[PDB]
Amino acid sequence: FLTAEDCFELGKVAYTEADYYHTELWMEQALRQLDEGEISTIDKVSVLDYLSYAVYQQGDLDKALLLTKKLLELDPEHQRANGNLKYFEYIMAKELEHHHHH
C-alpha cells in the first residue's frame, strides 16, 4: 500500500517523461485515496492539474473538461485551469455552431 503522496510523486515522474497514460493511472489512484479521506499533505487541485493535462494529451477532451471543472470548483482562481476551460468552451461552441448550420 502506497500513500497518496507516493502515487502523486510517481505520477509526476510519469508526466515529466510525457507518459500521459501512467500519469493518469497514478494521479487517479492518488485522487481515489484522498476521496476516501486519507490524511495527506498533497492537495487535490495539483493532482487534478496534472490529471487534466494528461487526459487532454490522450485526446479525451470531454474528460479533460470535466476534470478542469472539478479543479475550478476547488480553486476558482486557478489561472491555467481557467485558461484551459476557456479553450475547451471555445472548441465546444464551434462544434455546436457547426451542428446548427448543418
Partner: peptide, 6 residues
C-alpha cells in the same frame, strides 16, 4: 492551446 504544469 491548453497549458499543463510546466
Amino acid at each position: 492551446g491548453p497549458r499543463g504544469p510546466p
